[PDB]
Amino acid sequence: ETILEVNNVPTNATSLMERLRFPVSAQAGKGELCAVFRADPGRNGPWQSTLLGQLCGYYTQWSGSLEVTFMFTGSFMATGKMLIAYTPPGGPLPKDRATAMLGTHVIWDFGLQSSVTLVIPWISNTHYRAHARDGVFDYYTTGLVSIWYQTNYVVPIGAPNTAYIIALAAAQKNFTMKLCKDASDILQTGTIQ
Amino acid sequence: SDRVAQLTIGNSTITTQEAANIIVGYGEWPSYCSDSDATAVDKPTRPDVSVNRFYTLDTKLWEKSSKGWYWKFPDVLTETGVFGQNAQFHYLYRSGFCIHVQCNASKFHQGALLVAVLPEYVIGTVAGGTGTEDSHPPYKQTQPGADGFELQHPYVLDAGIPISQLTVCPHQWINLRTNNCATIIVPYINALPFDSALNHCNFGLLVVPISPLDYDQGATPVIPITITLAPMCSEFAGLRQAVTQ
Amino acid sequence: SDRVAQLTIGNSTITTQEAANIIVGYGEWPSYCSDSDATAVDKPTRPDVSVNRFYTLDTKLWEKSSKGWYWKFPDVLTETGVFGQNAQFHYLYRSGFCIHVQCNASKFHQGALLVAVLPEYVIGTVAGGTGTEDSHPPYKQTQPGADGFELQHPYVLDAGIPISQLTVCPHQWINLRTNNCATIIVPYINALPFDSALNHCNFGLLVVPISPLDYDQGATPVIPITITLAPMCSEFAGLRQAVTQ
Amino acid sequence: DRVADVIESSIGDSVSRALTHALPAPTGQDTQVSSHRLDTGKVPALQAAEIGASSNASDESMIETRCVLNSHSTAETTLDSFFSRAGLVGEIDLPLKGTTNPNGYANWDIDITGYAQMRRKVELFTYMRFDAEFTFVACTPTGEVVPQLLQYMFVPPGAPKPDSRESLAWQTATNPSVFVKLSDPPAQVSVPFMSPASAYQWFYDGYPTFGEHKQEKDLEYGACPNNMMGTFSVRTVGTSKSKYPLVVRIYMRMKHVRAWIPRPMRNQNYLFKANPNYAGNSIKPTGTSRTAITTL
Amino acid sequence: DRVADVIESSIGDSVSRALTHALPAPTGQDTQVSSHRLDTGKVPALQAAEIGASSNASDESMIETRCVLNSHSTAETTLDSFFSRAGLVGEIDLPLKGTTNPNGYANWDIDITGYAQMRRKVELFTYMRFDAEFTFVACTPTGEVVPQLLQYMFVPPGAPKPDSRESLAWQTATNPSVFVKLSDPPAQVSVPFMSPASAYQWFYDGYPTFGEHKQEKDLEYGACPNNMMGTFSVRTVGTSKSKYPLVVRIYMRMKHVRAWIPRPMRNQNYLFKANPNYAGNSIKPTGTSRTAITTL
Amino acid sequence: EIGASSNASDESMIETRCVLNSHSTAETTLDSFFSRAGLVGEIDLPLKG
Ligand SMILES: CCCCCCCCCCCCC/C=C\[C@H](O)[C@H](N)CO
C-alpha cells in the first residue's frame, strides 16, 4: 500500500503536502458528496502518486482486482458514518446518494478500528485492459468511486470541528501485467552533466 | 464480539462497531414457498443477486420535539431498481426483509428510540374530533411512499392502541449511551402464499423517541436517522404489462 | 411430421402447419459461460422465465417493388419488458436467440424470400456517389431500433458485398409455394465471454425478396411479414444505475 | 448444472429454520434451594434491554429461596378455554309499525365487530381460524313468549337475497334453512371454516381493487373480501302480517381455535364497525392517575 | 435445494452440444460402382432447398459410374497453406526535400487494410488469430543501395512517440529496437498475438464510447480498440541530415493461423482504410455480361 | 496503524463466482524486466573541435 493523492487540487510549493489528505466536517444532514475519483491505475490522476501506478506505467496491459483503504485521523470523541460506492463502467457520475447506492458499496462506521477497506472487483468484458485515455481508448474505463455522507459528523463541546482522511491503495493477489514498454515520462530536460 | 458486526448480501456491505445483537423475528428465517403451500401453476422467477441487496431510502432529522415516523413495506421499494421493476411487472409477490437503522451521536448526548415492526398496521382517523364523521385517511397517509410519514398522536399509535405494549412485536432500542444501530430480520408474514405488491402492505416500521434528545449548547445539533433495508428470498410470478398505479 | 411444429419457451407458444425444419446455426446450441472462459468475479443473474420468451416487434408489408429490410440484435429488445430493463440496468450481457419469421398467402400467389443472419453486419455509405467524401452512416441507419430499416442497394447488401454469397450464413427460404415460416437458432457469437448490450450488436437479420411477389387482380393485395424472437440462456452482470442512451 | 454457482446455491430451500421449539408444561415451574454468593464475573442482575429480549434473571439468583413444589395447572389459559364462551354478536328487530323492518323480514350481514366485549377479545390477534356455533334467542320486546313460526335462511355470497316476505327465494331448495317456533328452546347449529384464505384476518392493510385510489373511493380501504361470509335472513312464515312484535338475538361460540401474531389491545372507545377510528378531541390515558409520583 | 423446479432445472449447463464432428480426410473421396435403378419411393434427385441445407445427391445416384481410386491430396487448401505467404502491407518514404517526412523520421500505424490484395484475403473471415513475421526492405527511390544506418523502434500503445530525429525517446531502454544497414540483407523478426481479446476482428458493429452518438462523433463507428497494436517508427541514426533519400517497404507473413465465421468476399473497389464505403454512382456487377441468355 | 497491508479479499466483501485464473506472472521477473539493452554512453571524435 502507498498513499493515494485524491486531493490533487493544490500546486504551490508550500501547499504540496496538502494533497495527501481530504477533510471531513459537520453538514446539514442531506447526504452530501465528499470526493470523487477514477479507478484506472495507469491513467493520469490520483493513482500516479502510488507505487502501483508507477510500476504499471511500464506495462501496456493489466488485469485483476484493486484495494483502497481509508484511515480516519480525527479525535477520539468524533463519530460518523460514510458511504463509499463504486460505479461499474457505462454509468454517469451519480447525481445523488440514491443513485450511488445502486452499485457495489460499503458503509463505514468510525470507532476503535480507524480504517476500512473498499475492494474494486474485476468487472470487464475482455480478459485484459489497455491503458485508457480520452478518445477511442476510453473503451477501457474501470468506473468511478464516490464518497457520500451517511448520517453526519458529530462532535462534542471542546473538540475540533474538522478532521482528515488518508487514502491508501494497492492490488490483490490476482493482479498481473504483460507487454512491457517504456514509461511515458522521462526525467531529463537536457544533458545530465 | 457481540458489539462489532458485518452484514453482506448481494454486492453491498454494512460495518458497525456498536451493536446489540441481531433479532430474528418470531424465531424464523426467510425461505421459499414449498410445493404443498403453493397454488399457482406457472413457475416463479428468482432473480437473486439483483434484488436481494441493501437499499437506503432517506435521512430524517431528530429534534428535541420529534414525535415519530412510520414506513410501509414493500411500498417503499416499489420504485427503486430491479426490485421495483419486477414488482410492477408481475402480479404475485413474496419475500422476507432485513432492516438496519442507523443513528450516531457523541458521548455527551442522550436519548432513546423504539424501533418496532407491526404486521397489518392499519391507520385510523380522528373521526372529525367528535366521533361523528365517518372519514377515512387519504392515500398519502396510508401509503406514504419512500419518504415516510410523521405520527400525529404517537400515544395511540394513530390507530387507537397503546404504545406501551408495542414491545410485543419484534423490536430493538437505540440508546445513545449504549449502541447506535438496530437490526431486525422478518420472514414472510401473510395468510396467503403469494400476494400483490401494489395493493397490500405486509407490515410497517415505527421509529418513536421515547426519551427525548438532549445536549448542551456548543455540541453538534444535527442528529440524522437513516434507514437501510434488503429483501431476502424474493419470488415473482404472473408476468404481464408494467403497471405503476 | 416435418411440416407441423410447435415451439414452447417461457409462457408463449407458436404453432405452424407449413414448415421446412429448424436450422441450428453453426451446429451449436446456446449455453452458459464456463468457469474457464469467465473473467469477471461477481456472480451473474439468470432471471430465466421472465426474459426467455417470444417477442413480436412489428408488421411490414410486402409489395411488388420491395427491396428488403434488416434488423439489429439485441438492439431491438433493449426497450421491451424485463429483458430491456435488465439490459439497461447491467453492464455485461450474453444470450442466444431463436428467430421465427411468418408470411402467409394463398395457393395463387407466388414469391420467395431469403432470411439470413450475418454476424457483425457493418453498414457503409455511398461515399457521396464519387468515392471522394469520407462520410459515415447516421445513428439511425446503424441501429434502427425495433422498426428496422429498408435497404437502398440490396445487390451489394449496403456494405459492398454480393448478395449471391449470403447463403454461406445460417439461412432459410420462404417460398410461398412450399412453406410460410422460417426458424433459425443462433448461439452466442463473439470473441469475448461478455459484452455490452448498448454499444455492441452481435449480428443482423436480413429479409430480401429474391423473386418478386405476383398475383392476379381480385386476390388479397396485402401480404404482411411479422418477426418473432426469443432470447435463450440470458446472463447479466455488473449492476449499476439505469442508463438508456 | 455445471457452473459451481448453481451447485452450491441455496435457492429453493423451502424448509423453515426454527430457533425455538415447544416443550410440555402442564404446571408451573418449581423453585429450588439457593444460598449466598460472593463472586466476581457473574452478574445475573445486570441486564441489557437494548437487545430486545426479556430479562433472564430468576428467583434463585437474586435472593435465598426454599424448595417449593408447584402443582398449579395451566389449563385455563389455553385458546379453547379462553374463547369457547358464547357472547352476543348481533340483534334483529321486527316491529309492527316502524321504519326499520316494518314488512316482516330482515337481513343481517354476518360480522363480529358490532359489540365491543367480543370485538376486543378477538382483536388481540391478527389471524384466527375456528369453527362456530350460533344460537338464536327469540322473544317479544317485553320478553313474553308467544305462538309464532319463524324461518332463518343462510345466504352465501352471490346468492339472491329476499326482497319481501313472499319472495320466491324462500323456497330454500339449496340454501340451508331452519323452521322454529317461539315456544321451542332456542335453535342452534354448527358452522365450518369457510374463508378462501387459511385464516380470518381482522386487520387488512390495503385496498381490494386495482387502479387509482382517490378520495371518493376511500371507503374501500381496509376491506377484506375474504371475511364477507354472506347474509343471515329472517321472516315470519305467512302471507298476512303477524300479530306480535319480535326481537332476535344471536350468540356465537368458537371451537377448534388457532391464532397468530398478537398485537396491543384496544385503548380507546369504538366508533364504527371495521374501522379503527377514534375520537380525536377526547384521548384518554390507558389507566387512572394520581397527584404526585412520590406519594400513593 | 428442495422445490422440484430447481432440482430439474437445466440452468448452469456450460457444455456445448455439437451436432457435428470432424473426421480425417487426407484425400478426395472415391467413387464406387453403380448400376441402373427402377423403383418407386426413392428419389435422390428431388430436393427441397427451402430447408436451408445443401443437396445430398451423389454421383452414384444419378448416373452409372465405375470404381475410381482418388489419391489427390487436400493439403494445399489449409489455412496455413493459404496464409503463410508474405505480402506488402505498408510503405514509408523519407525524402530530402518534401512535405511528408522532411525531418528524417516517420511514424506508421500498424494496419493491414492499406493494400487490397491482402485485405481481400483477410476479410473472408470475421475473427482471426495468428503470429506474424515482418520483413523490412530498404533502398533509394531508384533502387540503389547506399551506406546508411537506420533504426526501427516498436512503440506499444500508451508509450511516448518520438517527435524529432534527436528525441529522448530513441534511448529505447524498454521498447525493442533494431539497428541495421542498407548493405545488409533485409531485417526480419517475429511477432506474437497481442490482442486483449481472443482474436482479431476486422468488422466491429458498434461504438467504442458510451453516451449519445451524434453526427460529429460518427468517425468512431466501427472502430475496435482491440486491433490498435501500436506504432512503428523509423529514423536515420545521426545528428545532421542524411545524404540520400530512402524508401522502406514492409512485408508480413502469418503463421499458426486460426479463423472463424466466413462471410462473402468483397465485390466493389476499396476507398478508405477501416471503412466499408463504396462508390454509389458506379456499382458494377460481380462478373461479366453477355447479350442474350439463350446464346453464348 | 500497525504498518501492514489489508488482508481483506474479494470473497469477504461481495458475492463472487468461481473463476479459474490462468494468467502468467513470468513477465514481471527481474530478468524479464532488465534484460533489454539501452543507451548508457556516447563518445564523439571530431576532426576539428
Ligand atoms: C339457519 C342458519 C343461519 C346461519 C347463521 C350464519 C352462519 C354463517 C357464519 C359464517 C362464519 C362466521 C364468522 C364470520 C366471519 C368473521 O367472523 C366476520 N366477518 C368478522 O367481521
Ligand SMILES: CCCCCCCCCCCCC/C=C\[C@H](O)[C@H](N)CO
Ligand atoms: C523493430 C520492430 C518493429 C515491429 C514492427 C511492428 C510489429 C507490431 C505488429 C503488431 C501485430 C500485427 C497485427 C496487427 C493487428 C491487425 O493486424 C491490424 N490492426 C488490422 O488493421
